Nucleic acid binder design. Structure first.
Lengths: 310, 184, 73, 89
RNA sequence: CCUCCGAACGGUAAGAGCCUAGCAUGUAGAA
C-alpha cells in the first residue's frame, strides 16, 4: 500500500535486491505544553501544590470505564440489535405466559447503554380471554443510576392513568454481560419490589433480564420462588455475590415476543429516564410523574449534559 | 518580614521572645502553611479569632516536623508580644478552653515565676477534656489540669523547652507566694 | 548485633551497636546515649528520606556499617 | 505614607485548579498561565507555598500600600472581640 | 588476661528561571 512515485533510489535498490524491515507496535521510540496542577511534596516534604509542564506522567488511560469511551461503544448499538438471542426457558405454563411486544423490546434494547444497569417496570394487562397469555403492556422507567450488576430506581412505584388498565407483569433489567442465572442484585430488586409494591405479586411478578450477549442481546424470562423471594428481600448482602442465595431462589420462565401487539412505553415527564450520568437525583425519595413518551437516549445530549459544560 | 518580631517589643528572658521556641521548630513553623495562610498580619484581636477555632493542643507531629496550629499561635503571640493584661483576659476566659490554655502557655513562656504560679495555679480547678495531638499524629484526651501540671512541672510542653521556673518552695520560703490553697 | 555509624557532618560522628530487630526508636535512644541529644529530638535521614521510628532496622535494610545522616528536631 | 499591614479576610484559592489542565500556547498571557498569578504584582509563582511566600512578602505588600508593621490592639478591642463571638454563638 | 573507641577534606553538574528570605546595615554632616 505504498506509492511507487514516492520510493527513493535506495528504496528501489533494496526492493530489487532483497527485502525491507518492518516496524511492530512493540518497537517503541521512547529514546503545545499542558500545565497540570498536582498536590506534591517538596524536597523537605512540605505538601505543596505545583503547576508543571513536563510531559512525563501525562499518558491518559481511558479504558473501558470512561464516559467518552462508553459513549463511543454505545454508538452503533442499534446495529447490534440484529441477532436477538432469545432464551427458550423451561416454564411449563406456571402462570400468565409471556407474550411480549417486539417493537417495545426492540426500542428498549437500542435505547440502553451497556456500561451500567438499565431497567424499567414492564407492566400491562392481559389480552382479552388470556388464560396463559400475559400482557407485556409497556416498560416505564424513571430517573435512576445503575451499577455493573443491578440498577437502582426510584422508590415510589409508577401510577398513571394509562397504567390503570395495565397490571404489573414485572421488572426488566439489562445486565452488562451474559449469565445463566439471576444475579444477587436482580434477586434483591425482585424481593424489594415484592415487599414494597403490592402490584409485584408472587406468581404475577416476573424479571425480563435483557442482558448484553456476545454480538446481540439475551432476553431471559425469570421468576422468584416464595422462599427465594423472602431470602432475596431479607438478604442484606447487596453485592455481586451475596451470602444466602440458592438455585431455588429463581427459576426460568417460558415466554416469547411478537410484533402483533404494539406496546406502550412510560417515559419521564420531568427528566430523562437514564439518569446515570447525573448521580445526584437517583434517591429513595423519588416521587416523579411518568408520561406517555418513548425512552430517551442512554447518552443523549440531555441524558448526561454535565459533560458538555467544559 | 512576616516573621520578624514587632519593633515595639521587649526582650523576654534576655532574648528575642520568638527565641523562646527552639530554632528548628521556629523554622518549621515559619515554613508551615498555617503560619503563612492563617497567621499573617495577625494582631492580638485576630489571635483570639484563630484561638477560638483551635480543636486541639500539641507541638509537632509526624516524621517531618509539622507544627500544630496551637504552637503556631503561640509563636505568633511571642512575635506580637501582647500586653500582660491581655494575656490575663485570655486565661480568665472560662467558655473557650483552648484560648485559656494558649494564654496559659504564653504566660508560662513569658511571665516570671510569681506570675506563672499566681495565674496558672487557679487553673488546676479546670477538669475539661481536651484533644492533644501526639507525635505520631494521633489524638489523645487529656484534661486542662494535666496540661497545667505539665506546664508547671515538666521541662518540655508542646515540644517547647520552657524557661526554667524557680521551685515553688523557694518562693514560699521567700514569702513572695502564700502556700498553694487547693479547692479541697 | 550490627554496628551503624550515625554521622552529622558538622561534627557528631557516632558509632552505635544495635540489633537488626531494633526499631528506629531504639537506635535513636542509643544515639541519644552516645551524643547527648534527647532521643525524641533526633532525625535519621538518608539524604532526604526520614527513617520512621516504628519501622524495624531490618525493613529499612540498614546493614552493618551503613552510615545514617544525623539531623535534629 | 504607608498604611499598617492588615490581615487578609478572604481565603486563598490555592486548591482551586487541581486537575484543571491549562493548554499553554505562545499567545497565552501570564494571567491564564499555569500556577498562581499576582494581579497586583504581575508575577507568576508555581507553588502554593511559594505563592504564600509572595503574598506575605515585602514587595507584594508594598504594591498594596502597606508595610511590615502590625497594629497594637488594646484591652477593650480583645474584650469586645470575646463578647462579639459570645453573641454570635 | 588481651578494652587504642579518631576526625575533616580529597563527594559543588554547568545552566535557565521566578519568588520570598536570613541578612543587617540604616544613629553623620547641614542649611
Amino acid at each position: 500500500n505504498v506509492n511507487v512515485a514516492s520510493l527513493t533510489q535506495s528504496e528501489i535498490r533494496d526492493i530489487i535486491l532483497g527485502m525491507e524491515i518492518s516496524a511492530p507496535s512493540q518497537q517503541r521510540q521512547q529514546i503545545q505544553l499542558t500545565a497540570t496542577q498536582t498536590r506534591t511534596v517538596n524536597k523537605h516534604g512540605d505538601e505543596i501544590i505545583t503547576s508543571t509542564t513536563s510531559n512525563y506522567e501525562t499518558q491518559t488511560f481511558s479504558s473501558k470505564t470512561e464516559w467518552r469511551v462508553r459513549a463511543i461503544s454505545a454508538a452503533n448499538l442499534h446495529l447490534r440489535t440484529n441477532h436477538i438471542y432469545v432464551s427458550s426457558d423451561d416454564i411449563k405454563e406456571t402462570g400468565y405466559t409471556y407474550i411480549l411486544p417486539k417493537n417495545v423490546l426492540k426500542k428498549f434494547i437500542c435505547i440502553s447503554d451497556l456500561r451500567a444497569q438499565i431497567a424499567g417496570y414492564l407492566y400491562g394487562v392481559s389480552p382479552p380471554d388470556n388464560p396463559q397469555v400475559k400482557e407485556i403492556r409497556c416498560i416505564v422507567m424513571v430517573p435512576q443510576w445503575g451499577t455493573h450488576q443491578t440498577v437502582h430506581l426510584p422508590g415510589q412505584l409508577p401510577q398513571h392513568e394509562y397504567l390503570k388498565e395495565m397490571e404489573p407483569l414485572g421488572w426488566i433489567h439489562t445486565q452488562p454481560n451474559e449469565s445463566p442465572q439471576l444475579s444477587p442484585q436482580d434477586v434483591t430488586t425482585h424481593a424489594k419490589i415484592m415487599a414494597d409494591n403490592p402490584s409485584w405479586d408472587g406468581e404475577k411478578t416476573i424479571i425480563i433480564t435483557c442482558s448484553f450477549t456476545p454480538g446481540s442481546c439475551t432476553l431471559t424470562a425469570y421468576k422468584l420462588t416464595p422462599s427465594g423471594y423472602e431470602w432475596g428481600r431479607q438478604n442484606t448482602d447487596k453485592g455481586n455475590n451475596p451470602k444466602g442465595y440458592l438455585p431455588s431462589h429463581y427459576e426460568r420462565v417460558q415466554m416469547l415476543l411478537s410484533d402483533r401487539f404494539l406496546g406502550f412505553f412510560m417515559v419521564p415527564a420531568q427528566s430523562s429516564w437514564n439518569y446515570n450520568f447525573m448521580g445526584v437525583r437517583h434517591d429513595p425519595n423519588m416521587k416523579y410523574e411518568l408520561q406517555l413518551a418513548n425512552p430517551k437516549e442512554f447518552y443523549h445530549e440531555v441524558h448526561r449534559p454535565s459533560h458538555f459544560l467544559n | 518580614m512576616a516573621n520578624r518580631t514587632v519593633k515595639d517589643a521587649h526582650s523576654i528572658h534576655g532574648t528575642n521572645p520568638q527565641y523562646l521556641v527552639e530554632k528548628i521548630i521556629r523554622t518549621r513553623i515559619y515554613e508551615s502553611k498555617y503560619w503563612k495562610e492563617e497567621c499573617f498580619g495577625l494582631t492580638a484581636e485576630l489571635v483570639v479569632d484563630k484561638a477560638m477555632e483551635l480543636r486541639f493542643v500539641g507541638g509537632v507531629y509526624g516524621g517531618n516536623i509539622k507544627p500544630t496550629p496551637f504552637l503556631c499561635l503561640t509563636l505568633k503571640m511571642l512575635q506580637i508580644q501582647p500586653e500582660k493584661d491581655i494575656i490575663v483576659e485570655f486565661i480568665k476566659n472560662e467558655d473557650f478552653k483552648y484560648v485559656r490554655m494558649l494564654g496559659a502557655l504564653y504566660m508560662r513562656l513569658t511571665g516570671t515565676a510569681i506570675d506563672c504560679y499566681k495565674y496558672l495555679e487557679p487553673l488546676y480547678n479546670d477538669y475539661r477534656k481536651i484533644k492533644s495531638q501526639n507525635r505520631n499524629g494521633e489524638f489523645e484526651l487529656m484534661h486542662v489540669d494535666e496540661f497545667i501540671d505539665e506546664l508547671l512541672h515538666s521541662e518540655r510542653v508542646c515540644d517547647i523547652i520552657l524557661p526554667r521556673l524557680q521551685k515553688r518552695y523557694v518562693l514560699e520560703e521567700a514569702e513572695q507566694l502564700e502556700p498553694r490553697v487547693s479547692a479541697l | 548485633m550490627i554496628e551503624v555509624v550515625c554521622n552529622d557532618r558538622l561534627g557528631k560522628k557516632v558509632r552505635v551497636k544495635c540489633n537488626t530487630d531494633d526499631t528506629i526508636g531504639d537506635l535513636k535512644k542509643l544515639i541519644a546515649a552516645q551524643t547527648g541529644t534527647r532521643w525524641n529530638k533526633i532525625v535519621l535521614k538518608k539524604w532526604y528520606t526520614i527513617f520512621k521510628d516504628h519501622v524495624s532496622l531490618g525493613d529499612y535494610e540498614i546493614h552493618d556499617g551503613m552510615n545514617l545522616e544525623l539531623y535534629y528536631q | 505614607k504607608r498604611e499598617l499591614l492588615r490581615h487578609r479576610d478572604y481565603k486563598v484559592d490555592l486548591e482551586s485548579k487541581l486537575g484543571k489542565t491549562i493548554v499553554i500556547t505562545k499567545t497565552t498571557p501570564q494571567s491564564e498561565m499555569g500556577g498562581y498569578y499576582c494581579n497586583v504584582c504581575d508575577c507568576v509563582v508555581k507553588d502554593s507555598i511559594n505563592f504564600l511566600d509572595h503574598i506575605n512578602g515585602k514587595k507584594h505588600q508594598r504594591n498594596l500600600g502597606m508595610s511590615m508593621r502590625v497594629e497594637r490592639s488594646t484591652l477593650d478591642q480583645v474584650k469586645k472581640r470575646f463578647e462579639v463571638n459570645k453573641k454570635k454563638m
